[PDB]
Design a protein around this ligand. Sequence first.
Ligand code: NDG
Length: 142
Amino acid sequence: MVYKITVRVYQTNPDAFFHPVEKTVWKYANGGTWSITDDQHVLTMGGSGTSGTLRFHADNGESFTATFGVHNYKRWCDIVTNLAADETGMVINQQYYSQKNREEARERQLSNYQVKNAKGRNFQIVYTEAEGNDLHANLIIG
Ligand SMILES: CC(=O)N[C@@H]1[C@@H](O)[C@H](O)[C@@H](CO)O[C@@H]1O
């Protein structure tokens, strides 16, 4: 069965403005699509076992990735900050299926995750619909 993750982005801090610069879809489970409906980022996936990554950039230089997926039928998420110039969204997304620390994050099947970058800015994902096939998450930028 298809899994869908609908993402709403909340920017709370006027000291920066982030915008999406990359949207990737991993190749497992017949892939999927990132679309937009009413300013929400919708990731539609062919079944359980894949994910997609949104990369955001602020004009002040800050950036991060937010990755959303389903692993053994349960949602997961992760945020990577302090990105190198050669860590594009497609690099990060693939690492969830090759790099140990990323694979472990996926395997945790988190309904919520937060992390701060080197400047102390908080980034959080919270699934407000956290079970079943029609999943909804807030991405909250501090
Ligand atoms: C500050 C930062 O980006 N830390 C992350 C963490 O958020 C993420 O869970 C991880 C595994 O993918 O790699 C990095 O340790």
